[PDB]
C-alpha cells in the first residue's frame, strides 16, 4: 500500500518534469 | 646524512626545496613592481 | 549470458564508433563562427 | 498511519493542485 | 519490522545503530554535569573494532 | 544551500560564457563600462543553450 | 559445480574477449561504421 | 644553535635575493 | 615585458602574451625545466641529509630515494641501504644541471631573440606549420625513446634494478631475457582497469617492465623518425585544431591521464614501487594483518582452518568468489593482492593449508608484522593510524603521499585540458572573445530551441 | 582434473577460472573399489564439491518435495583439504572419520519465489559406517551465526542489547524469540558417501555423496529447512 | 544536395534545431544515462536485498522490501566482489547478480560515462551556438564530486561496497562512516567545500537581492515586477551603478565588483573551486590521508592530557567507528 | 684536502649567489649586457672551474 503511494508520487513528479520540459510556455523573442 | 666533507653545508641544504615556491612569488613581486602593467 | 555479452559489445562498439567517426567528420568546421 | 496518512497525502496533493489549476485555467483563458 | 524480523536491515537501521554508538561514546566526556562513568562493558560496540 | 551554490556557479558561468564581444582584446573584463544601457551577455543565447 | 558461468573475470583478458566472436563483432561493427563514413566522405 | 643560525642566514639570503634583483633593476635603469 | 594594451591579455594571463614569441616561450620552457631539475636535486639532497640509516625509507618521508633505490643504487638484499653516496651524487648532478638550465632560460627570456623565425629558421616555428610541429614532436619522441633505452641499459648492463620478487626478500638483479613478446606486452595495454586486471598497474615482474620499455623506446624512436619525415594526413588536418593552445590542451589531457595512472601505480604496484622502499600498499597491509593474526593464533595452538567468525564465513581463511583460498575478513576485498612475502605460501588453489601450517619463514613474519604496523593510513599532519588514533607515531606512507598528490595533479590537469581545448576551439572558430552582437547565431536560428 | 595436473598449474593460471572450487577427478585407476588394500589409513586431502542444491518445500496442494534453487553466492561452496582416518576391513566394512580442515562453507540459495535460504554446507566431525559401495553417518552442523553476531538492532547472544531499545515501551513477552534469547544450539546432519573410482598405486579414492542437513535458524527464529546436497568427493589415503 | 547517409545522420546529430541537443557527446550520453535511469528506477522499486559487506548479511534497499522514499536505496556491490567489475554476463544468474550488488556497478559506470559526456555535450552545444566554452569547466566540479564518491573512493578503499549508496539514508550512512574513518570535518579541503557551499548561498542571495533591489520601475503594483523584463530586450533591466553604490556603502566602497563581468566571474569561480577542493579531499581520503588528528595534542606540565573539542569529536568518532559494520571486522585495525 | 674542498665549495656558493643576483640584473639593465660581458663571462668561467674543482677534490677528500 505504502509502496503504491511512493511509486505514484515519484511517477507523478516525473510526469510534471516531462510536461514542464516538453510543454513549457515558449519564450518569445518579442 | 650528507658525506662528511659536505656535512657543514647541511643547513643550506635544508633550505633549498622552498626556492621553487619562492619563484612564483618572485613573479608576483615583479608584476607588482611593474604595477601589474 | 554470452548472447547478452555479444549484444552489449555490439551496442557499445556501435555507439563508440559513432562518437569517434562523428568527431572525425570535420567537426571543427561545425561552428557558426566567421573564419 | 496506513490510512490517515493516505488521506492526508491525497488532500495535500489535490487541494493545492485544485487551487493552482483554477488560477492557471482562468489565466490561460485570458491567454 | 526490524524488531519482529532479524533479517531486515536498511541503511536507516544502520544509522540508528551509529547514533546509539555516538551517544554512548560521546556522553561521558561531552556532558560532564551528567557525571556519567559508564564501564566499558556497557558501551555498544561491534566485533573486533 | 546546495541549490543556491549550484545557482551561483551556473549563473556566473552562463553570464561569463554568453558575453557579447563589445571590444577588441582577449581580456573580456575590460569590455564592460558601468555607465552603459545595454546587456553584456546574450539572454537569448543563454536561454537557447540551457 | 552446481551452475554454469562464463568465468571470464580477472585473467587479464584482452578487451574482455573470452570468445573470438566478440572480437569479430567489435571489428565488424567498427569497420561497418568506418566503411559508411569512408564511402560517405567527400560528401560535405 | 649554529645550525639554526646558518639555516636562518641562508633563508634570509634566498628570500632577499629575488626582491633585491627587482629593486636593483628598478633603481638601475629598468626593462623589468 | 608587454602590457595589456598591446597584447589584449591581463597580467594574470601574461604568459599568453608569449604564445607567438618563440624565443621567449623557449626561455620560459628552459627556465621551467631548470626549476624541475632544481627541485629534483634540492629535494634529493634534503632527503639524503635527513636520511637515517637504521629506519626504512618509508618511515622517513622520502619519495625520491625510493626511486633511486628501485633503480638499484646503494641498496642490497632485502632493500637494506648500503651507501647514500649514489643518492648524493644524483642530487648534486641535478642541482648543478639546474643552474645551466636556469641560465639558458633566463637568457632566452630576457636578452634572447623574441622570435626565432628570422635568424634561426631551424628553431623558428609557427603553430600552423604542421610539418615543423611534427618535426619537433619527432625530436622529442627520439629523446624519450633514448630515455626508455637508458632505463633498459641500466637494467641489462649497468647493475640491474631492484627486484622485490627475487628469492629471499628481493635484491638488485640483472634482467636477462626481458619479455619482448608482443602479445604479452600489449595485453597489458588492452587489459581491463578493474580488480583482478588492473590494466598496466598489474605488471608484476621486471622482465615484463623492461621488455615493455624496449618496446616503448623502439616505438618512440620509430615514430620520431616517422614524424620528422611525414606531414599529418588530411583526415588528421580536418580532425584536429592546429594552434599552440590546442597542442597544449592535447598534452594536458595526456598528462592528466598519466597522473591518474601514476597515482594508481603508487597505490597498487609493489613491483615498480617495492614495498621495501615505499612501504606496503593498502592491500598489502590488510593481508599482512590477516597473516599476522593467523600465525599468532597458530602459535597459540588454534586451528586456523576450522575457525569461523561471527558471520560464519571464517575468521582466518575463506574463499574468493572464484574459489581460491584467501584470508578472511574485510581483506577479502584485497584477495587479488600479490606480494613477495605471501606468494611462496600460495599453491594453485590459493593459500595452501600445509604451507601455512609448516612453511612460514621468519623474514616473511617480520615483513608481515612491519607492514601491519605501517599501513598507509595517517592524517595530513602526519599522525599515523586511523582518524581515531591519538598523536603517538609520526607516519604517512609515501604511497599515500604520491597517490593523493598525483590524483590532485591529474584532476587539475584534466580541468586545464578542458579549459584549453574549449578555448582553442573557440579561438579557432573566432568567438573566444564573445558574441558579435551584430551577427548573433541564435537570432538566425529557428525558435522553440 | 587430476590432482597431479592441478598441482602442475600455477596460481596465476588457476586464478579466476573456478578450478580452485573443483575437486580432483581420478581419471586413471579402476572402479573395482573392493580391490583396495584393507587396513588403517590417514584420510588426507579430503575434498567435497556439490553439483546440486535442493530445498525441502511444501506447496499449497499438500505435496512435499525437494525443489531446485538458484545459487546466490559464488563458487565458495567447496570443501577441501580435510584430514582424518578411515578403517577398511577384508569383508568390505568401512569406518570413516574426518578430523579437521575446511569442513564448512556458508552458502545461500534462492527458492522459487525469492526466498533466501542461507545454510552451512559442512561435513565436520563426520562419523560414517558402512561398506565400500556406501557408508552413511552423521556430522555436526554448527550455528550459522556466531554468538557475537549482532542483528540490525544490535541484539545478540554473547553481545548486544538483548531487547529492542528503539522502542522504550515495547520489548517484552512477545518478541521473546527475537530479543529475550538468541539461541545458538547446534544441529546434526546426515550423509551417505559412496566410493566409485579408486587407484591403488597412489591411494586416491573418489566417489559421490548425498547429504541432508538443516539450514539456518536465524538465531532461534523461523524454523530451518532441509537442504539436500548431492555432489562429488575425493581424497587420498595414508 | 548532400544526399549521403552519413552526412544526413551527422547533420541530424549536430543539429541545433532539435528540442534537446544530441551531438557526438550526446550519442554516448543518452544511451548510458537511459540505461542507468532504467536500472536505477527498477532496482529502487523492486530489487532484492544485497549482501553489501560480503558477510552473507543482506541489506534490503527497495520499496517492495519494506523501504520508504527516505530509507530506500540502491545498495552498493558486495565486499567479496571488491573492485572486480561484476556485469550481468559475469553472473551465473540474475538472482546472483542481484544478490551481489550488480545493479550498483551498472548504474555507477553508466552514470559516470553519462556525466562525462554531459560535460562534453555542454561544451559541444556552446561551440555550436558560438558561445564561450567554460560552462563545462564549471560543471566539472559536481562531476568531480560524483566521481570521487562513486568511483575514486571505492578505488582507494578497494571495494565498491565503499561507494556511496544510491539513496538518502544510504548517503547519510556514507557520510557517518566516512567521518568515523577519516575525520572529514577536520579536513581543510572539506572546510573549503563547506565555505564554498555557504559562500555560494551567500553570494547567490546577495547578487539576487542586489539585482532585485535595483530593478527599474517598468510595471505597476498590481503586476509582478518580473513583467518589467521582456525576453530579448536590449537595455539593462536594473541599475548596476545603484547596486554597486549600495554594496560599497554597506561594507566597503573598495573591495567591490563594479565590473559586472568580474562579479559574475567571482560568482562562477568561488563555489566551483571550493567544490573542486572538497572533491579532491574525498579523493585523497580515498588513499587514507585523513583530516587533522589533534587527539591528545594539548598536555599539561606533568603530561596529563587536557582534552579539547578535537578530543570530544574523537569520542564521537570512536562511537561511530565501533558501531559501523558490527559483524564485518575480525581484527582490531580497520586497515581495509 | 677536506678543508680545500670546503673552501672551494664555499667559494662556489658565493659565486653562485653573485651570479643569481647579477646575471638577471646585467641582462635587464639598459646596455648592461653589452658592457659587463667580461665580468659575466669571468663569473661563469670561475663558477664552472669551481664546480669541476669540487668534483675533482671529492675523489681525494
Ligand atoms: C574502462 C575504463 C574505466 C576506467 C575507470 C574505472 C576503473 C578505474 C580503476 O579501477 O582504477 C584502478 C586501476 C588499478 O586497479 C588495481 O590494480 C591492482 C594491480 O595490482 C596487482 O599487481 C601489482 C604489481 O606489483 C601487485 O602485485 C598487486 O598486489 C596486484 O594485486 C589490482 O589488480 C587491483 O585489484 C586493481 O583494482 O588503475 C588503473 O588501472 C590505472 C588507470 C588510471 C585510473 C585512474 C582513476 C581515475 C580516473 C579518472 C578520474 C577522472 C577525473 C576527472 C573527472 C571527474
Ligand atoms: C602544462 C601546464 C599548462 C600550461 C603550459 C598553461 C598555460 C597557459 N594557461 Mg593554464 N591551466 C592549466 C595548465 C597549463 N596552463 C591547468 C592545470 C589549469 C587549472 C585547472 C589551467 C587553467 C587556466 C586558466 C583558467 C587560464 C589559463 C591560461 C593560460 C595562459 C596564461 C597563463 C598565465 O599567465 O598564468 C599566470 C599564472 C598565474 C596567474 C598563477 C595562478 C596561481 C595558481 C593557481 C597557484 C597554484 C599553486 C598551488 C599551491 C598548486 C597546488 C594546488 C593543488 C595541486 C594542490 C597560458 C598560455 C589563461 C588563458 O586562457 O589565456 C589564454 C587563463 O585564463 N590556464
Ligand atoms: C615558471 C615560471 C614562469 C616562467 C619561466 C615565466 C616566463 C616569462 N614570463 Mg611570466 N609569469 C609567471 C610565471 C612564469 N613566467 C606567473 C606565475 C605569472 C603571474 C604573475 C606570470 C605573468 C607574466 C606576465 C604578466 C608577463 C610574463 C612574461 C614573461 C616572459 C618575459 C620575462 C620578462 O620580461 O620578465 C622580466 C623580469 C625581470 C627583469 C625580473 C626577473 C629577472 C629574472 C627572471 C629573475 C630570475 C632569478 C634567477 C634565480 C636568476 C638565475 C640566474 C642563472 C645564472 C642561474 C618570460 C619568458 C611577459 C611576457 O609575455 O613577455 C612578452 C609578461 O608580460 N609573465
Ligand atoms: C608530488 C609532490 C610531492 C609529494 C608527494 C611530497 C611528499 C612528501 N614531502 Mg614534499 N615537497 C614537494 C612536493 C611533494 N612532496 C614540493 C613541491 C616541495 C617544495 C615546498 C617539497 C618540499 C618538502 C619538504 C621541505 C619536506 C617535504 C616533506 C614531505 C613528506 C610529508 C609532506 C607533508 O607533511 O605535507 C604536509 C601537507 C601539506 C603541506 C599540504 C599541501 C597543500 C597544498 C599543496 C596546497 C593547496 C592549495 C590551497 C589549499 C588552495 C589555494 C589555491 C591557490 C590560491 C594557491 C612527504 C613524503 C617533508 C619530509 O618528510 O621530507 C623528508 C619535509 O620536511 N617536502
Ligand atoms: C609540483 C610538481 C610535481 C612534483 C614535485 C612531482 C614529483 C614527482 N612526480 Mg610528478 N607530476 C606532476 C607534478 C609533480 N610531480 C604533474 C603536474 C603531473 C601530471 C598530472 C605529474 C605526473 C607524474 C607521473 C606520470 C609520474 C610522476 C612521478 C613523480 C615522482 C618521480 C618523478 C620522476 O622520477 O621523474 C621522472 C624523470 C624524468 C621523466 C626525466 C628524465 C629522467 C631519465 C629518463 C631517467 C634516467 C634514469 C637512468 C635509468 C639512470 C641510469 C643511468 C645510466 C646508468 C644508464 C616525484 C615524486 C612518478 C611517480 O613516482 O609515480 C607516482 C610518475 O610515474 N609524476
Ligand atoms: C607523444 C606521442 C605522440 C604524439 C602526440 C603523436 C601525434 C600524432 N600522431 Mg603518432 N606515433 C607516435 C607517437 C605520437 N604520435 C609513435 C610512438 C608512433 C609509432 C607507433 C606513431 C606513429 C604514427 C602514425 C603511423 C601516424 C601518427 C599520426 C599522428 C597524428 C594523429 C594521431 C591521431 O589521430 O591520434 C589518435 C590515435 C589513435 C586513435 C590511435 C590509438 C591506438 C589504440 C586505440 C591504442 C590502444 C591502447 C589505448 C591505451 C586504449 C598526431 C600528430 C598520424 C599522421 O598523421 O602521421 C603522419 C599517423 O598516421 N602516429
Ligand atoms: C574521464 C575519463 C578518462 C580518464 C581516465 C581514464 C583512465 C584509464 C583509461 C584506460 C583504461 C584501460 C584501457 C582499456 C579498457 C578496456 O580494455 O576495457 C575492456 C573491459 C573488459 O571487459 C570485461 O573484461 C572482463 C575480464 O577482465 C570480463 O571478461 C568481462 O566479461 C568483460 O566485459 O571492458 C570494459 O571495461 C568496457 C570498456 C568500454 C568503454 C566504452 C566507453 C568509452 C567512451 C568513449 C571512448 C572514445 C574513444
Ligand atoms: C586552483 C586551480 C586554479 C584553476 C582556476 C580555474 C579558473 C576558472 C574556473 C572555472 C570558471 C567557470 C567559467 C567562468 C569563466 O568563463 O570565467 C571567465 C573568465 C574568462 O575571461 P577571459 O576569457 O577574458 O580570460 C581568459 C582568457 O581568454 C585570457 O584572458 O575566466 C577567467 O577569468 C580565467 C582567469 C582565472 C585566473 C586564475 C584564477
Ligand atoms: C577488436 C578488433 C578491433 C581492433 C581495434 C584496433 C584496430 C586497428 C585500428 C587502427 C587504425 C589506425 C588509425 C587510422 C586512421 C583513423 C582515422 C581514419 O580512418 O581516417 C579516415 C581516412 C580518410 O581517408 O581513411 C584512411 O586514411 C585509411 C584508414 C584505414 C582504416 C582502417 C580500416 C581497416 C579495416 C576495417 C575493417 C574491415 C572493415 C570492413 C567492414 C565492412 C562490413 C563487414
Ligand atoms: C623567466 C622569468 C621568471 C622565471 C625564472 C626562473 C625559473 C629562473 C631560474 C633558475 C634556476 C632553476 C636556477 C637554478 C640554480 C642553481 C644554482 C644557482 C646552483 C648551485 C650550486 C651550489 C653552490 C651547490 C652547492 C652544494 C653542493 C654542490 C652539494 C652540497 C651542498 C651545497 C648546496 C653546498 C620569473 C617567473 C621569475 C619572472 C618572469 C621571468
Ligand atoms: C613500459 C611498460 C610497459 C609497456 C607499455 C606500453 C606498450 C604502453 C603503450 C601504449 C600505447 C600504444 C598507447 C596508445 C594510445 C592511444 C591513445 C591514448 C589514444 C588516443 C586518441 C584520442 C583521444 C583521439 C581522439 C579523436 C577521436 C576519438 C576522433 C576525432 C579526432 C580525435 C583524434 C580528436 C609494460 C606495461 C608492458 C610493463 C611496464 C612498463
Ligand atoms: O565497507 Mn564501508 O567501512 Ca571502509 O573500513 Mn573496511 O570497508 Mn567497511 O569497514 Mn571500515
Ligand atoms: Cl554501518
Ligand atoms: Cl577485518
Ligand atoms: Na565489527
Coordinates of N, CA, C and O in Angstrom, one line a residue, chain L residues 32-55:
Chain L
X32 N 73.4 47.0 -20.2 CA 74.3 46.4 -19.2 C 74.9 45.1 -19.7 O 76.0 44.8 -19.2
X33 N 74.3 44.4 -20.6 CA 74.8 43.2 -21.1 C 76.0 43.5 -22.0 O 77.0 42.8 -22.0
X34 N 75.9 44.5 -22.9 CA 76.9 44.8 -23.8 C 78.1 45.5 -23.2 O 79.1 45.7 -23.9
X35 N 78.1 45.8 -21.9 CA 79.2 46.4 -21.2 C 79.8 45.5 -20.1 O 81.0 45.5 -19.9
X36 N 79.0 44.6 -19.5 CA 79.5 43.7 -18.5 C 79.8 42.3 -19.0 O 79.7 41.3 -18.3
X37 N 80.1 42.2 -20.3 CA 80.5 40.9 -20.9 C 81.6 40.2 -20.2 O 81.5 39.0 -19.9
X38 N 82.7 40.9 -20.0 CA 83.8 40.4 -19.3 C 83.6 39.9 -17.9 O 84.0 38.8 -17.5
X39 N 82.8 40.7 -17.1 CA 82.5 40.3 -15.8 C 81.6 39.1 -15.7 O 81.8 38.2 -14.9
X40 N 80.6 39.0 -16.6 CA 79.7 37.9 -16.6 C 80.4 36.6 -17.1 O 80.2 35.6 -16.5
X41 N 81.3 36.8 -18.1 CA 82.0 35.6 -18.6 C 83.0 35.1 -17.5 O 83.2 33.9 -17.3
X42 N 83.6 36.0 -16.8 CA 84.5 35.7 -15.7 C 83.8 34.9 -14.6 O 84.3 34.0 -14.0
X43 N 82.6 35.4 -14.2 CA 81.8 34.8 -13.2 C 81.4 33.4 -13.7 O 81.5 32.4 -12.9
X44 N 80.9 33.2 -14.9 CA 80.5 31.9 -15.4 C 81.7 30.9 -15.5 O 81.6 29.8 -15.1
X45 N 82.9 31.4 -15.9 CA 84.1 30.6 -16.0 C 84.5 30.2 -14.6 O 84.9 29.0 -14.5
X46 N 84.5 31.1 -13.7 CA 85.0 30.7 -12.3 C 84.0 29.8 -11.7 O 84.4 28.9 -10.9
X47 N 82.7 29.9 -12.0 CA 81.7 29.0 -11.5 C 81.9 27.6 -12.0 O 81.9 26.6 -11.3
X48 N 82.2 27.5 -13.3 CA 82.4 26.2 -13.9 C 83.7 25.6 -13.4 O 83.8 24.4 -13.1
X49 N 84.8 26.4 -13.2 CA 86.0 26.0 -12.7 C 85.9 25.5 -11.3 O 86.5 24.4 -10.9
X50 N 85.1 26.2 -10.4 CA 84.9 25.7 -9.1 C 84.1 24.4 -9.0 O 84.3 23.6 -8.2
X51 N 83.1 24.3 -9.9 CA 82.3 23.0 -9.9 C 83.2 21.9 -10.3 O 83.2 20.8 -9.6
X52 N 84.1 22.0 -11.3 CA 85.0 21.0 -11.7 C 86.0 20.7 -10.6 O 86.4 19.5 -10.3
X53 N 86.5 21.8 -9.9 CA 87.5 21.6 -8.8 C 86.9 20.8 -7.7 O 87.5 20.0 -7.1
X54 N 85.6 21.1 -7.3 CA 85.0 20.4 -6.2 C 84.7 18.9 -6.6 O 85.0 18.0 -5.8
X55 N 84.3 18.7 -7.9 CA 84.2 17.3 -8.3 C 85.5 16.5 -8.3 O 85.5 15.3 -8.0

